[PDB]
Amino acid sequence: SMYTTAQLLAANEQKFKFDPLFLRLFFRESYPFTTEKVYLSQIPGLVN
Amino acid sequence: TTAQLLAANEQKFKFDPLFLRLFFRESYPFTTEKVYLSQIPGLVN
């Protein structure tokens, strides 16, 4: 029952900066593996 | 004694609307008692 008046003027969304350069830049190929575990192997190449 | 008024300058102080001209545009007259300003956090973990 309030008799006052109000007129909205602006509603601004403050958003924190966030930009993914590391994902866009180095990690470029996606391998979705359906199994339980993943294997990674490195072979040394020091021949005496 | 006669005389004549050849020149008469008007003094002025260096005044210029800079902040209002640069940062304040889009005037909004309002026919309302009080105004509302609102903002949304937009902060998610």
- Resolution in angstroms for this experimental structure? 4.0
Rounded to whole angstroms, the Cα distance separating B7 from B9 reads: 7
B42 near A11, Cβ under 8 Å? no
Identify how many contiguous H helices and E strands chain A contains and give both numbers: 1, 1
Picking from A22, A24, A19, A2, the residue whose alpha carbon sits closest to that of residue B33 is: A2
Please name the residue of chain B whose CA is at the shortest distance from the CA of residue A3.
B33
Rounded to whole angstroms, the Cα distance separating B37 from A6 reads: 10
What single letter denotes the amino acid at residue A4? T
Of B31, B36, B43, Cβ closest to residue A9 = B36
Q: Which two tokens stand for residue B24?
A: 């304040």
- Sign for the pseudo-dihedral over CA of B26, B32, B33, B38: negative
Of A4, A11, A15, Cβ closest to residue B34 = A4
